[PDB]
């Protein structure tokens, strides 16, 4: 039953970069053995798609900066010239038998200019207040590298364990990310504070930003 | 017309439950090569878990649902199948469908979208959605999708018109058990007033579909 064993694990590279991933088989297979391992990328949410098949054959359709090789229990997928459509995550696979089986993957993140996030706070709405709960939401658009740490201040109480953050896949087109952080708090505790602030820290700040609002404008 | 495979059947389903997923085939003949189903449990790798040589009806099994799990495939209908079985928290995972290109092709050369299997006891139930209104050159706007199971939502802009700058961010999992997330798009500020933005949720494990208009 042969098992791929793929590597590096994550890698971050920039736009341009020559970039080599590796996949190794437990099977001894010998150095005039080659041709029986197919590469995968898969983009978050998507099927994956076929890039290389028997080593080194480029699928029809896929550009010319794929290239892979291999022999023995050795393959490596290269990317010439890495492009920002190139972020996801890459997969080989053994065909010379089965079951079929895949490598663990490979991600493959875009390296690029830092950008400091655009901040953007949003009030609870009022079709929302009559449930009987509230949520106020901070945006922080567009920007890179991933790391950034949002905190929310009520009336200056620092808020915690009440919040809950999601951030977006790397974008395919600018390789920047994208955050949002949701406070969720009772009517009763919503009403009796006043001002909302969200303080978000990037290393594209030289200072931390503050988007706030009193309730009720 | 061009080769495509479709899958459908996915959604929630209770542990020890069954469940029948379906892919259809198009622009070839199941006849001239294997079927397969592929998984992906979240955030984890690709698991291959059934073939099936549609002719003469050969299959065989990942060990892992060897016995649950039953592949099956209907020529006349170019379609294949998936019957699971007894099903645990462990089989949550995307299924696709795909196949081997042929006589001499290996390899996995088209595969469907993927349909989302959810196993668990927790039941069915549709989002609330709230506005994330805008005030003060650029604006930003959203909807709130708000407590709602199992996954997933689609959420687009002014009925597919506006996609540009639109971020529909993963849902995270509440304490309570159900699913939130936001979809933000940055706008120009002079628009306001002047266009209306909407965002078309829709959650079809509810049949679930629900326009709102986003304003100050």
């Known amino acids: 039953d042969i098992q791929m064993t793929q590597s590096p694990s994550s890698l971050s590279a920039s736009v341009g970069d020559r970039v080599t991933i590796t996949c190794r088989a437990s099977?001894?297979?010998?150095?005039?053995?080659?041709?029986?391992v197919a590469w995968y990328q898969q983009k978050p949410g998507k099927a994956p798609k076929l890039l290389i098949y028997?080593?080194?054959y480029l699928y029809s359709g896929v550009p010319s900066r794929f290239s892979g090789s291999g022999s023995g229990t050795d393959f490596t997928l290269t990317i010439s010239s890495l492009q920002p459509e190139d972020f996801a995550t890459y997969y080989c696979?053994?065909?010379?038998?089965?079951?079929?089986?895949f490598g663990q993957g490979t991600k493959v993140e875009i390296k690029r200019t830092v950008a400091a996030p655009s901040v953007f706070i949003f009030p609870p709405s009022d079709e929302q207040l009559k449930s009987g709960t509230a949520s106020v939401v901070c945006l922080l658009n567009n920007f890179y590298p991933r790391e950034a740490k949002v905190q929310w201040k009520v009336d200056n109480a620092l808020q915690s364990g009440n919040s809950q953050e999601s951030v977006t896949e790397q974008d395919s087109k600018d390789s920047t990310y994208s955050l949002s952080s949701t406070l969720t708090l009772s009517k009763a505790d919503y009403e009796k504070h006043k001002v909302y602030a969200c303080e978000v820290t990037h290393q594209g700040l030289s200072s931390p930003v503050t988007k706030s609002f009193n309730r009720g404008e | 017309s061009e080769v495509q495979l479709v899958e459908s059947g996915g959604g929630l389903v209770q542990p020890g439950g069954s469940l029948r997923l379906s892919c259809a085939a198009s622009?070839?003949?199941?006849?001239?090569?294997?079927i397969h189903w592929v998984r992906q449990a979240p955030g984890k790798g690709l698991e291959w878990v059934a073939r099936?040589?549609?002719?003469?009806?050969?299959?065989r099994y990942a060990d892992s649902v060897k016995g649950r799990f039953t592949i099956s495939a209907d020529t006349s209908k170019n379609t294949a199948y998936l019957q699971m079985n007894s099903l645990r928290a462990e089989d949550t995972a995307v299924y696709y469908c795909?196949?081997?290109?042929?006589?001499?092709?290996?390899?996995?050369?088209?595969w469907g979208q993927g349909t989302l299997v959810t196993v668990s006891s927790a039941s069915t139930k549709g989002p609330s959605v709230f506005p994330l209104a805008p005030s003060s050159g650029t604006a930003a706007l959203g909807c709130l999708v708000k407590d709602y199971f199992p996954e997933p939502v689609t959420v687009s802009w002014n009925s597919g018109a506006l996609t540009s700058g639109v971020h529909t961010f993963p849902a995270v999992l509440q304490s309570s058990g159900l699913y939130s997330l936001s979809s933000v798009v940055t706008v120009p500020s002079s628009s306001l007033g002047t266009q209306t933005y909407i965002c078309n949720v829709n959650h079809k494990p509810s049949n679930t579909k629900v326009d709102k208009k986003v304003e100050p």
């Open positions: 795909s196949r081997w290109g042929g006589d001499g092709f290996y390899a996995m050369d088209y």
């Open positions: 622009g070839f003949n199941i006849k001239d090569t294997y």
């Open positions: 099936i040589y549609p002719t003469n009806g050969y299959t």
């Open positions: 099977q001894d297979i010998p150095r005039s053995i080659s041709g029986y």
């Open positions: 028997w080593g080194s």
């Open positions: 696979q053994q065909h010379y038998t089965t079951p079929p089986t």
